[PDB]
Amino acid sequence: IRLEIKDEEARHLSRKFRDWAYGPVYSSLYDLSMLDTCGEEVSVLEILVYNSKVENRHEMLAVEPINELLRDKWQKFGAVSFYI
Amino acid sequence: MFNRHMLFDIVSRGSTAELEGFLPFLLAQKKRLTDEEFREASTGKTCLTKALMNLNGGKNDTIPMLIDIAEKTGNLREFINSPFRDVYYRGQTALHIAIERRCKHYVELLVEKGADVHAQARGRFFQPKDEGGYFYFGELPLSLAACTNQPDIVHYL
């Protein structure tokens, strides 16, 4: 997930990016390549919840993008699905 | 070349030998550096503002040269003091950018040629997080240099 390669030829497969660095504020950039598979077979996040029976899944959800990726779709779908 | 797209590139390239002969080229076609077209129609980003974005180790030799070309046309208080014309990055000048990337040599160059100290970067980006912006500093270059952990510009201002 934290993959940023300096070799500049294996760059198109790098995962972490740096958008803009205006002093104190850094703008990182994570790819949702396999995290939220919209029209694909099966996702990373689905195996984190539906398939993995390992104890470490509580720590494994506490990685950097997924703590904010789950807050994305909660803010868009939580208030709507509750009111229905 | 003679167009704007060649000129906005080579400044980011930072090759002053590829910018030769443009000063009497403006003598021929009577054009100012910030007349209508050598400035972004969406934002207002000029050649000097583009020069401070892309840097070569924090050094671009076009920066005294763009002031030199502006001196012959007579826009030293205009080519330096032209803020952004957009809404999101509204009011940001080249003085805000040079303080931002800690070019202490180039901060001294702007004011000596004539720079507005009290230019306010009052854009929607420069608002606090409750208002929709990402970074707040009180819209002032003196306050900006204090927010960038740099007292060296603070002594200079």
Shortest Cα–Cα distance, A19 to chain B (Å):
13
Q: Which residues of A touch B100 (CB under 8 A)?
A: 22-23
Q: Give the pair of three-digit tokens for residue B74.
A: 């007579």
CB B84 within 8 A of CB B42: no
- Return d(Cα A53, Cα B60) in angstroms, integer: 57
Q: Which residues of B touch A26 (CB under 8 A)?
A: none
A37 Cβ neighbours under 8 A, 6+ residues apart:
A43, A46
Strand partners, A28: A18
Shortest Cα–Cα distance, B97 to chain A (Å):
9
Q: Does B148 contact A23 at a Cβ distance shorter than 8 Å?
A: yes
DSSP string, chain A: -----SSSSS-TT--EEE----TT---EEE--SSSS-SSSS--HHHIIIII---TTHHHHTTSHHHHHHHHHHHHHHHHHHHH-
Structure determination method: X-ray
H or E element, residue B111: helix B104-112
H or E element, residue B109: helix B104-112
- Return d(Cα B154, Cα B142) in angstroms, integer: 6
